[model samples]
Target: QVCTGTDMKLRLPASPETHLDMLRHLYQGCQVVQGNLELTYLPTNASLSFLQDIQEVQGYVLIAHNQVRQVPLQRLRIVRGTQLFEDNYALAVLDNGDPASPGGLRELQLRSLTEILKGGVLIQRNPQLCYQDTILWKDIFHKNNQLALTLIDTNRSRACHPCSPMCKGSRCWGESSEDCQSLTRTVCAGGCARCKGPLPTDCCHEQCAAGCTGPKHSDCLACLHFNHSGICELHCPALVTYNTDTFESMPNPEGRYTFGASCVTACPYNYLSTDVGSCTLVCPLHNQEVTAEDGTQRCEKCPCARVCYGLGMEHLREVRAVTSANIQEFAGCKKIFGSLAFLPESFDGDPASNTAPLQPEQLQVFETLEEITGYLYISAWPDSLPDLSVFQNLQVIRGRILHNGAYSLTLQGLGISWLGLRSLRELGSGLALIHHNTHLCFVHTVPWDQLFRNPHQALLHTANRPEDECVGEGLACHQLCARGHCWGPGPTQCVNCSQFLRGQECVE
Candidate 1:
């Protein structure tokens, strides 16, 4: 064996032809490894107990891709660099170099390794080792910062329960001769260390009892609701008594009782009962408004009539089609508070073959509409030329318009063009998004620059470019290129390096 230099690397070979005695001699000469030490690719006969006396590794300790198991570095105090143990497929917490060996290393004793600076510690992909249970391993995790910690996906085994004497009134888990020392005690004499459920009141009086579901009650016993306080109460308090049926406090019943009682069921008009029998007034001004299924009064504000397509399309058939109908369906609604989808119940092949265009009669229903105070989403139409000419009179849209995923704008998977949403102008509290049309090009001809003025301000038109070109390149204006390539007051105008350099308002 030769002595290592100040910056030398010591890499042990793992050939079957090599002798284990020579390897132990080589390790005996290695007191201080200045460079990195790699012990990998060892054969099945190799043992790692030769590294038991290593006090420090100035560089990294990379023990990986080997067949050896337990590494008892009892005297190793400091590793100035990374400590990586990874990708050993058959590795476990304990091995004795014999295939017939029964008891493996149940505990990992790295007593002196308190500090690991510079390179981080990585222990991953070892399926047989459970380093989480050992005290030395836990101290390593508690002492290091998150940047220095990379402990994940190791052993599937649980923490080896610490062996201790049973506390005063707490019963132990095991009973036999092998069970006492071989098996770990469930509850120790020190305290309720890492335990679940309620702490035993039979042991210590001041011990903060754990939160339990029910049964035994004590002064410090924590229940479901009272997490930090006394025993669990099965019923409600004295002051809040009510009926077992409606849970409402009845008043002046049968000319006998005038005040609150715990047995009555019904309440007066304009009053409702909670599930727990609390009687409260049904005042609409203070968040007490309730909805009934058979109401005749029209909704004046949001949540106007629940209209949808998927999952509940059968319920919306009576709501009178918005494409061709009278304004009676939208009578008292100022803000439509539901999703509007023009999709079929379920479509399979080519959206064009499934349906027909919007006829003039169908388009006339939206002719009286001037302003929409809600979201207007138009999609899934089979029309080669969808007629929005009916909405030519519509001006103010105070809500968002999301036109999405119309698979019909393609001539045999090529571009077919024209979405026809030019009638829209003002958007008070809304944005516009036209995405995933696949083959429709020429966003410049769509008149969005004239309508929104700044398309990047609220309009996001992407993923709807020509079939052959790159996604955002076919747009009339740049949506992502200016943000990715340029920086200025007009950020959505540049496409290349010359435009980006000309708009050099990027702060240093």
Candidate 2:
């Protein structure tokens, strides 16, 4: 006879007559076994499967000297205590059984058994125990460090396995025989003969199956070479930023720049993109670090300033230059730290001429620019200035501008007629210097009320000669009148009568 209870060490008798019936009653209505479960010296027909209802065990599970072919507990998921199986010569399988054998358990699926708290998993002296490859012992051990595990003397030892031929004389799992045996049982996986190193050797074919730059799969480093996307490289790319410990490309999650298809791309605000596959802090010319408003360390100024030279110059001497062919050279520079000046040559072909306007293709270079850390100056002569509308996407200018001596609408020598700074909004801690452009009459057309509030704030000296009245009514007069009647060549009628009167006669 058997008794059911909430907490009791149901010690099954060694007698085969009552073992099976006792086990069934012992696990009846029992969700958890508060005490130990011991089944010792049982008959071959006495199956332990009655304990399948057991979900948890506060105490250990001791199965020794039993004639049972397998240790049954198919539904047993977790054991808070320990598990011990020893000297059970008939116990050829822990929870699994042989297919041909009459009493053998087909498979041992302890997949639900996650946590092992008190006593470790100790199974020894079972010579017939085979098929050790079915369970992931290392994964269980990795997830639960406090759980002790000892599997020895079995038919196929989990810890003791024959090394692959590639391991040579050294004990290894994934080594190529030429290297030393450094791989341990814990390092190898899926019964593989060798161990793959931390860094992936064949990234092209395996897509870094061995490993990339980080211990975790998400910590993928930038390709060692080739900016093109989708192709995984075997080695770390040149000058690409990588993790010091994990060798990952971008370890910091706060960063915006990463090792994508291209080396130079975008980065977070106040950060600079680096060739090392990371978004680094801007470093001042010689200073190491600076404190930012957010109480974080940042660079005072970006170390690398892209200075492109064009129009037959050896190198970019300063921010100002005349050329567009080499504007593509600036593509390598992710951000501009210092000043940027585009001074096109005049008719005379002098570097200071500022006559030759920017060509249509040259305007494409500014498309890559996002922010300017310093001033942006465009000093060119009249008729040489290109359409300022090319910079439609320009967002920020941390510095000021000085449009000196350029053309106006009247063909009269003045500051550039239109301040094509359509996209400009915020200016840095510098003053605008729109001085000496003879016919540059932009007092009413430009946003002087907002940009230049005080005379002392800037070096504003727009001095040229032109009366308020129109000179004539033909093409020359119509062009001059058009400036007052219309904002530009856009198809909009003038609302102010004085604007229409500025022309010889109102066409509208």
Candidate 3:
């Protein structure tokens, strides 16, 4: 019923708890593809490829893990039908967009069906597209004239019986097994409930069909036609329930992620795991929604909780110190009261730069500037240069950290440049994580000198380690080179032939 690419690659900004939850649900039925997704957002560039798919989609959710990967984009198609958002789950906004939208890539989308799988959250972004300072959203749709419906296929052997592909089964058999005369009386439709007698048989009439009117009622002509036919038919009435006192639950289908196996709508565990069933971590690759919850619905960004801004530096502190290192000053600067200016308009006649320069004595603070490392983000009322002398190592100020409209933080005036920060660069590599920042959007973009340009992007291949690369891309082997074929704890290091075969630790 569904065609899938062997393995596709995808990347998404990491944030928003709901993103990952939704991805796990979307990946259940498909191969979960991976391909390069390229998105352009003016001054910024992002690229990644990865997706999920299954047959007859109900809905999908694009996800991005926390500080793990970028948020993925939504892939749309006509097949599996539309991914309805409202009916399946709730939307929780994580933050607000402002001067420049801080969580540069944190985004998500999801579709709904019979019921949004519980515990399903957003995961990652598709990495194929980008929308700067705009409402970022994914696309989804539905197909077939069948009434818009999100599917909840709990039709397991223990719950509901699986019918023949021909739509012929016990329900379709008319009167007697050998009675061909009643063949016209049985013909089960999409959802069958019960089987009547061999002659003028009545199709199912159960929980699903309970409040039915029009063509769905008990005496509908469609049901009468299928009931009379001797061939096994399908129905939608509440399936015959067995006395649990004497029966055991049915086992899952053999092997993993099997499409033929009947799937239950409810997750076996309230929580999701990567090692479990056909469930995946994000939206489908080609055109597929894993568990049919989309009916009249299209794929949508996972609803997220409001962005939390409970973290950041407390009231600014004033520190004045002197150092001896030669700091790599920014591209342009003028020393006044220890602060660097964008430059005077006298040089370029640009009035915007005509702000009066401060004298070391006028500012009442005087210290030799040494270096500038990171940019400054201004969220509240804007204020210019803190006496630069206090900030010996000043660089670009990443301004505009606020939520003007959208759900992400803004990074407008943060003084970051494309140039490198030699002073900020270190000899050894380790994760430059934001372990303490309370703001959820901080992860998307942190203040770093151009010297540490795109710190997160550079660490993409390493910070996530072999698993991050291996799981999504076909480069597990390549990354293995950096650490040898050893999957262990601690940092990833390469080993020699002897150590590799013996599984011995690396030597100094």
Candidate 4:
């Protein structure tokens, strides 16, 4: 059975809202699609063993922006000239397998593919990808047709294995020699509806495109995804009307399926089939795209509640610290792989803040850092700095590694009027040690447990501007309290009252 009239498009990260319903079509495989095989924004650590059965595609195959090197087209052998990408090549692999990260691709495992009936080839900008120069293009393509072929900036500095001894010349298929191809010339000149014996033919039935024995449909040795038992049956066994591209079963299914070289009953377990049926392992994925932490756009996937299948949760662009010397180098970074310290030149580090005394615009470069896998440290910031609103987007602190073995967040400073943390939402442990901020206002009044997994016994907040001295704009609470205790400026800033009055405040 052969699946036609569909494309197999795999985008990165799976999502239910954007992709789950539409991509459900390929929960079973798609084998031979008439449209393009588009794989876009492929990530580094994806699990895709489900697509190894793809065999043929009539349209172009575009593998773009993919980080994974092993393409699972294990049985893929042909790309019929029926369609093209940009009206050009049948196969295009571009801007994939970058060298800067883990899972950096080294070789393409697209081993069994053999033909490109239409268009040309394009391969470019894949810094770590290899096996580009080993292919013999003239040995592919129908009629030995020579079309557009461009190979630039690919594996320019590398060495790799030669073809397997069993392979016919350098015309290899995949990394292993078992995937090598062996072919002899076809004497059936011009065209072959079904070339028999490599020399003779009867123009077999249109359903028998592999090769035929006689001029009838039953004589095909192997056909184009359509053959029942021994004969080339265009439709499934119990079939009916076949028009346009739809089929009606005896009560016909509106479509057909392509099982390996034949149309049959219920398809193999993982293979996608219709009531009408088409045996293919590739189909379109209509998922919405989003920008990953690296600031590049890709598809998204939904996560199931804890049977524990966390996909590459350990992969992040870990860095040492952010300072004036190397601030520009981490421009696109989003997640803090380790302890992220906003440093000064000296209890450990940002001179840019000391020289100008913490201007909001100067620390704006770190605005994009959203999540921290370890701890957050705002140590020894200058007194002129008002708040940490510079870290506006930080939403979560994983708290994997704490400073001095205890602090998940360390705001070790003497001044700074406010915490500047407005957007924080969660924390893995939320064990913070906010010590000696004599000038910090509203420090004790903030809801400490709101962001923590459990806020008890994990905090060490003491020795700040005393409640007795909690006065004035920067030095004390500006509230007009009548002998009461208040946290900050404002009529409602009271924590307790010295006497009886629900509306009044209290102080020591």
Best by lDDT: 4
Candidate that beats the other on lDDT, 3 or 4, i.e. the better one: 4
Tens digits of per-residue lDDT for model 3, 182-299: 1221223443432233322343343221111232333322221122221112321122333588865443332222111123232221112122333332223232222234311111
Model 1: CA > 4 A from native: 1-339, 346-360, 384-387, 400-416, 438-442, 446-457, 465-508
- lDDT-sorted candidate list, best first: 4, 2, 1, 3
Taking the tens digit of each residue's C-alpha lDDT, what string does model 1 give over 342-362? 332211223544433334444
Per-residue lDDT of candidate 2, residues 1-508 (tens digit): 1111221122333123533554454455455563345555555566566566665554456554454655556445444443333321111124222224343322233433433433445544433343333344433332324444555334532233343465434332122333223332244444322224423331222222212343322333322222234344443344445777997865433223342222333533334444334544434344334335663334344354344323222354343553543456656443454455554442124455443444655656667665555555555543545234444345455431211111011112334544444344444323444434444433344343343322222323334323241122111222333334322222222212334442323444
Better of 1 and 2 by TM-score: 2
List candidate 3 stretches off by more than 4 Å.
1-12, 15-52, 56-508
Candidate 4, lDDT over the whole model: 0.53
Q: Candidate 1 — which pairs collide?
A: 94-105, 247-277
Cα lDDT of all candidates, in order?
A: 0.36, 0.39, 0.23, 0.53
How are the candidates ranked when ordered by TM-score, highest leading? 4, 2, 1, 3
lDDT of model 2 at residue 124? 41
Q: TM-score for every candidate vs. truth?
A: 0.26, 0.29, 0.20, 0.39
